[PDB]
């Protein structure tokens, strides 16, 4: 269930790592390789995550609570954008409370990332799926 994000890699790695690059393809390609640190989910635990469908990819997406209140989020993703932009969001959310994650919209770093501003229109419905999820899964907690 476990991975790097908001562990070993954080919203500033993430930002300092992405600030250099001017070039979009050279956003993608950071995008595809951060994507790659995120850990096959077996199908053991997709069962237990929630299946999110933007228009061109699916992702599974769960989450824990620690007695803390702190929530892990833990999912998977065919494609390697897809798994990029899970990257991303796993960093922005993993390991908060249920009340702090009400605070800000959960996309806010994709788009201090750069990465908004060129991603296909497409995208952004498979990209609010994963906000709603995050504030649905609050609602519960």
């Not at 609570?65 to 798994?83: L, P």
């Not at 788009?111 to 609050?138: F, H, P, V, Y």
């Amino acid at each position: 269930a476990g991975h790097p994000f908001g562990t070993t890699v954080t919203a500033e790695t993430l930002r300092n790592t992405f600030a250099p690059l001017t070039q979009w393809e050279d956003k993608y390609r950071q995008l595809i390789m951060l994507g790659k640190q995120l850990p096959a989910l077996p199908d053991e635990l997709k069962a237990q995550a929630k299946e999110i469908a933007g228009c061109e990819n699916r992702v599974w997406l769960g989450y824990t609570v620690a007695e803390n209140g702190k929530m892990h989020f833990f999912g998977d993703s065919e494609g390697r954008i897809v798994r990029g932009l899970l990257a991303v969001l796993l960093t922005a959310v993993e390991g908060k409370t249920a009340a702090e994650l009400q605070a800000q919209s959960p996309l806010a770093l994709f788009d201090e990332l750069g990465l908004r501003a060129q991603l296909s229109a497409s995208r952004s419905q498979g990209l609010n799926a994963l906000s709603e999820a995050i504030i649905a899964a609050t609602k519960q907690v």
